[PDB]
Structure 1
């Protein structure tokens, strides 16, 4: 009722990327994800 706008767009671009195959430089990624898994199995050697 004071005529202020209640709508907005927002926007974002990941900064500082651009890898060169020609020079093998620049960052392809913004960060890396990591993790590790231990798995155990039992096989049946006669049936697969």
Structure 2
């Protein structure tokens, strides 16, 4: 009722990225994910 807009756009771009294959420089990634898994199996040597 005060005539203020209640609609908005939003935007984002990941900064500082850019790798060069020619000079082997520049960051391709913003950050890295990391994890580790331990697994155990039992095989049947006669069937696969």
Shorter-chain-normalised TM-score: which range? Answer: over 0.9
Shift of 1:18: 0.4
Q: Find the aligned partners of 2:28 and 2:45 in 1 and give their Cα distance.
A: 44
Q: Please give the TM-score of this superposition, normalised by the length of structure 2.
A: 0.99
Where does structure 1 differ by over 2 angstroms across 4 or more consecutive aligned residues? none
Q: Please give the TM-score of this superposition, normalised by the length of structure 1.
A: 0.99
Deviations 1:19-45 (A, max 9, x none): 000000000000000000000000000
Q: Find the aligned partners of 1:30 and 1:4 in 2 and give their Cα distance.
A: 37
When the two chains are superposed, the root-mean-square deviation of aligned CA atoms in Å is 0.2
Give the paired residue count: 48
